[PDB]
Design a protein around this ligand. Structure first.
Ligand SMILES: [Ca+2]
Ligand SMILES: [Ca+2]
Ligand SMILES: [Ca+2]
Lengths: 488, 488, 488
């Protein structure tokens, strides 16, 4: 079996045959075969343009990963928590971190699902830790100087340092066991409990019109008021939320009617199970045929329409049903699944590029995937800082990364152990570069660990500028390392 | 052919003969020779004494560049900017850019004269670009904080990035054809036209006693009150001040009199064109005879005295001429030349003393030459920033260099193509240093483009300090590469 | 001679005897043999406990250095500066310089005693210079912005650059002769004379109750109003404060009584020479017997008792004697030792821990030596900056390092020539690390010499942040070189 990477070394007349014949050049998950499109569907003379197109497509995927994370997933989780009566301070501390880090967890899980992309997963995590800590955080200090809380900052930086050192020693060991993932999850739950306890101690011391309006994502007044760039962003974004409202239910506890749309939701009780079945595991469960006569999707649709009719005739348009909260549960699950699908696509695209340009997995993980996953963090944090809440944004800038690393690594490793029935996940370090990446992350923390206390916790513009220059130097070192300029 | 450095290894009796017989030991800068003075006129026992005189001489040039920029160049540029109602951005983009780039265009053209020198032609350009965009910009920001104009800054940086990318692609391809040269020229013309159009759109939206007192640069009352050191400094500055006042007109718009000094101005109307003629390219045109009967300087004198007589008959003593502002242009142009020669002499100092020192070739064709080319830009920009025009200097910091890159590459390649009768000019990459320079320039541009908008266009001192640190890192990288300790 | 690290691989029975006979396992300058304690006094099963106990001891040491500098060293230095009417620059250049530089010189002499360690000594000197000139200066500027004096700063930086370049060329030649050492000493003498002359030119242009109250470190009024945790902190600080009060006299010009406690000062007049003699070279001079009949300690006790009795009978309790400021000198000198010894202990702990963790000596030999050797400076400079004298500490950050380099190198070389009866001392360059350290020192000096004057001598936080980033880059380069990432 010849390796996929040799494809660029063969004649153009045999590229299609080699791609079609090599099991390695086939991806186990996804809807599109990108390598086939690169080497068979398009002529070789148009090879560069196609790659550019892919990049554009890749960017669009990340946009989806933003919207589903911000407008449907996070509000559904917030409604679920409000059903459990959680405090506002805990919400401000955590929910933004969950909303910003869900794409990171799903991308890491998809990457760890296959050994060949395993090196991508770590490259997705540490690189993000290098970015959000250096650029985004620094950006906040540039936009609005403020005074940072001492004790929460020290706690967050200590927990992040502990997590980073644990992952460093795990990488040095070259393997991840089941007990290690369980310890990661236990450490995260310990951190959450510690945050709760410390906060407590500190505090103590016609139907057609409603469907047309609900399915309309264009607020005409706001769209008219916005500038040209915002108009372009909104028009580019319209199909994504159109599909999302169409398929994903959202429950908002802040609304007196709880976003009750009786016929829209009655249609959704049929739509959501169908998309769930047809999308789970790339639809493999969808075409499974029961007893050799009836496919699953047909009986799923029948049960869904029966339930929708029962609910529609059993409820009224004025008063939401007593079981309205269960909708959010559905509005949770499918939403997460949607993100998963998008995540898978992104990973596949990156792998394809690794075949074409003969690039290492770590370089792709720390450059493209990190930026794509952190664009949502950057937008949310900059918006929060500009609106007059820099303390919350800066606190989240360190709170979310710990949750990202711990939950992503632990859950991905746990699911890989459970699914493959293997006792261990093998981490193969892709040469020297990975070590450099880890080193960079640690150094950044050290800078903060010295810079913030030395300023008496009054963060200024120079701190952000220095962090930005540090990130530029880090990218300089990475670029030198990749192209083989420095080599043992 | 023996290297000129071998002068040091030869016997003291044969050094002068070797210098005389070897054309390579002749000054590339030209004008006053220095090596002949060191090795022929001065005995070796007097050579250490001789050495003291040149260092002192060197410092004197740094005084001249200090005076000409302080009293003649910058006030004339300010008068030109005020007279035409130009904004600071456009004036820095065109006039200060031409004045700063004349030595660089000349050096780039003469270097691009041959196929072997072609690799080096690009490296000096990139080094000068990096130095100007980093150190001069940082100094301007540190000395005087200011608010930059968003749209002109974005336009300038975008055009600079496009030009740098085009030059990088040209280097990667390894050849420059006719189409590339005409494309460079057309791009520069398009940039100038776009600047003009945007500016217009924004806008729409006894006599002998007088001569004697004018020719005196010394004020007796202030001289008496000055300290002994200050008196000595004034005495040292007196000769160059007198010569500049005799040679270079200055028009100060804010004073009502606008420096209208009639007899001195009539004298300048005839001496300044003579200075231009006998200074351009070391007087080659000055020695030229038209048909062997009338020399060029004679015709220049005739035209100058005709104009002087016309002004004498058509102008009065106490009322300014309505076309006085045009005189400023002349005072600008000569002043630029008064800079260039001085700068050249500085180089002719460093290069000469170095042969006795035995400085390495690899480091010089890249450090001394770029610094010598950009010393005029540094002096002019710092003097302008100190006086209270930071915006013009900051805009010129990009305008001069975009002009330099575009017009230098295009005009030099086109002239070489025409003279050599070739279809293309081959480009050789002389090691990793050119690629390092290009990467450094690109990364500096990226850092500026990210940092400046993030600061809400308020350029503080932290930005300048970070730029200085970035230049230190760049010099670290280039010094590491030159020694070969970082091998490909 | 087996490595001391092999103590880990041996059986628990013979580890103590291995520590006993192996000379490399014993520390020459410490009071306590930590390795002997861990491997002999404590059973192996309690080995982790000892480690954590040492950690606690380490922390307690950081408390002593916290108190001695805060209450005894800095007030005495301020009293000396005020009494002699010395400007902050001069006092920081001289007195704080010797106080911070004594342990360097001692370590440099010890290292230069063995010719094989000459390169290690010069590398340690360069590393200490880099650390003090970068990190200490940055922290000093961040903690308290100030306006530095122009002429003293320029003079100090020029002298330091000259010294660094002279050491560089001496290292490049590979030998240091007697003439070089005499030149170093003469240069230091010239520097001191120049400082003094320039300063002159500028200037011209019952007893029992009082003993109990004085020796009581507890203020009951502040004792009652304080919190439980700070009560524990005060209880912990009580013994060292009592010992320091008994040993170190304090003169405070800001108090009406000038901190005059006649019986306590009379007793200190006896105690201070006693403790000085008993700590100098661990009491070797104390055990010395003059002619085999009278020991030195008895003689100094008799002299101190006579002087104390004379002073007691010659002064009253109400008024302090005119020579009271002389006491400050004593209160200065002893305090310095009480810092130095403490610093030594910290090192003798860390090295021991390095034996347990098998840390590679590669990094420790130059870097770890510098941090333990400079910790006293760092403490003194930060404490002085916090109390309101940033200029003195900032000037010390250059004057003291000049003192270290010049005097250490000159005295070590001169002593080696005199002792060994040779004519030169041969310096072997041990790899690229020494060159990297020297180049980093030169680059930091150049960056400071460029940035500070451009800043108009107004030192703000951006300068310190940039210096810290520079140090992080320097440690990055050092780590890259030591690991063999870059091959020559
Ligand atoms: Ca993210
Ligand atoms: Ca120039
Ligand atoms: Ca020291």
């Amino acid at each position: 079996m010849a390796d996929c990477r040799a494809v660029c070394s063969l004649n153009t007349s045999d590229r299609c045959d080699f791609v079609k014949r090599n099991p390695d050049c086939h991806s186990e998950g996804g809807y599109l075969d990108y390598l086939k499109g690169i080497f068979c569907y398009f002529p070789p003379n148009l090879l560069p343009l196609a790659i550019t197109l892919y990049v554009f497509w890749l960017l669009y995927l990340f946009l989806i990963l933003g919207v589903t994370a911000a407008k449907f997933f996070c509000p559904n989780l917030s409604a679920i928590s409000t059903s459990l009566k959680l405090s506002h301070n805990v919400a401000g501390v955590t929910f933004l971190a969950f909303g910003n880090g869900a794409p990171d967890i799903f991308s890491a899980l998809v990457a760890f699902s296959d050994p060949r992309t395993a090196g991508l997963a770590i490259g997705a995590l540490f690189g993000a830790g290098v970015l959000v800590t250096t650029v985004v955080a620094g950006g906040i200090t540039i936009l609005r100087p403020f005074m940072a809380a001492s004790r929460p900052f020290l706690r967050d930086i200590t927990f992040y340092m502990v997590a980073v050192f644990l992952t460093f020693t795990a990488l040095y060991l070259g393997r991840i066991t089941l007990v290690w993932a369980l310890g990661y999850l236990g450490l995260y739950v310990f951190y959450v409990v510690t945050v709760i306890i410390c906060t407590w101690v500190y505090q103590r011391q016609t139907t057609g019109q409603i469907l047309l309006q609900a399915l309309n994502p264009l607020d005409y007044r706001k769209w008219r008021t916005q500038s040209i760039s915002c108009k372009l962003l909104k028009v580019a974004k319209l199909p994504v939320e159109f599909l999302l409202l169409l398929t994903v239910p959202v429950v908002d506890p802040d609304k007196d009617d709880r976003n009750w749309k009786r016929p829209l939701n009655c249609l959704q009780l049929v739509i959501s199970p169908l998309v769930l079945v047809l999308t789970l595991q790339s639809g493999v469960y969808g075409i499974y045929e029961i007893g050799g006569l009836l496919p699953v999707w047909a009986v799923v649709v029948i049960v869904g329409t029966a339930l929708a009719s029962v609910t529609f005739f059993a409820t009224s348009n004025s008063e939401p049903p007593r079981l309205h909260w269960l909708f959010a549960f559905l509005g949770f699950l499918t939403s997460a699944l949607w993100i998963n699908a998008a995540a898978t696509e992104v990973v596949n695209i990156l792998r394809s590029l690794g075949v074409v340009f003969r690039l290492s997995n770590t370089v792709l993980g720390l450059t493209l995937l990190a930026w794509g996953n952190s664009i949502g963090d950057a937008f949310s944090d900059f918006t929060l800082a500009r609106q007059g809440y820099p303390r919350m944004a800066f606190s989240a800038c360190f709170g979310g990364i710990i949750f990202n690393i711990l939950v992503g690594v632990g859950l991905g490793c746990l699911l890989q152990i459970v699914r493959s029935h293997a006792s261990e996940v093998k981490l193969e370090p892709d040469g020297l570069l990975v070590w450099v990446l880890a080193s960079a992350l640690g150094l950044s923390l050290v800078f903060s660990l010295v810079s913030v206390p030395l300023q008496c916790f009054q963060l200024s513009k120079a701190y952000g500028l220095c962090l930005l220059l540090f990130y530029i130097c880090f990218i300089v070192v990475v670029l030198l390392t990749e192209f083989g300029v420095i080599h043992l």
